[PDB]
Design a protein around this ligand. Structure first.
Ligand SMILES: *C(=N)CNC(=O)C1(NC(=O)c2ccc(Cl)cc2N)CCCCC1
Ligand SMILES: [Cl-]
Ligand SMILES: [K+]
Length: 215
């Protein structure tokens, strides 16, 4: 795999979104990974519907939380996911309003990265595109990130509580990193992004629950 890659530069990544008060990070993570695959497959990028996911993925708990893999499976079995335009984000769990004729993407399943394996995560990012990941995002030091490569030893890689999207990886002043898209809006972190430590013993659990959709 290459030393560095940044899918934002290849047009695979939509603007940073803001999930608001709803615990729908899983839906944003999911749609980000689906948006990458859409671009790679069709050459066109479009915002996909996180609300579609929050409302219709019955095996998840809406604004209470969810798994990305459940969302991919939903899209696969549903034969589609709506665009954000067709099914806008409202930030509370409502009745399912999916319309097949507003579908903007499909999914033929999903693959999971071997647990803890940052080298396999690197290879997935390099070869696939953006990958959904879960992390411990509970620390004040994460919440108030502004610059640099984030590393805090008190992060608990076994305490996953947030889902985000790995859109690349690189190195900054010998500190290898992952390029992470959050869903806390553009006024969070560095215009909505955080550089997280790569190859520092799976810092924050970055490679513990990674997956991507197949299209
Ligand atoms: C995002 N704002 C909150 N975090 C999550 O949703 C994560 N999943 C869960 O908390 C979770 C998963 C599955 C069910 Cl059915 C219910 C819940 N609450 C945090 C763990 C990592 C993946 C996302
Ligand atoms: Cl419903
Ligand atoms: K990390």
């Amino acid at each position: 795999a290459p030393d560095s890659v940044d899918y934002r530069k290849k047009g695979y990544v939509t603007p940073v979104k803001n999930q608001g008060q709803c615990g729908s990070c899983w839906a944003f993570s999911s749609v980000g990974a689906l948006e990458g695959q859409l671009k790679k497959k069709t050459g066109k990028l479009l915002n996909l519907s996180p609300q579609n996911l929050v409302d219709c993925v019955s095996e998840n708990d809406g604004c209470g939380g969810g798994y990305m893999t459940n969302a991919f499976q939903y899209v696969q079995k549903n034969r589609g996911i709506d665009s954000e335009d067709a099914y806008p984000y409202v930030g509370q769990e409502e009745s399912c309003m999916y319309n097949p004729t507003g579908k903007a993407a499909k999914c033929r399943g999903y693959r999971e990265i071997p647990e803890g394996n940052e080298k396999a995560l690197k290879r997935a990012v390099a070869r696939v595109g953006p990958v959904s990941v879960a992390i411990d995002a509970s620390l004040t030091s994460f919440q108030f990130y502004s610059k640099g490569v984030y590393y805090d030893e008190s992060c608990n890689s076994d305490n996953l509580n947030h889902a985000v999207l790995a859109v690349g990886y690189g190195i900054q002043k010998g500190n290898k990193h992952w390029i992470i898209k959050n869903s806390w809006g553009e006024n969070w972190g560095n215009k909505g992004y955080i550089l997280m430590a790569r190859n520092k013993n799976n810092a924050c659990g970055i490679a513990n629950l990674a997956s991507f959709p197949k299209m």
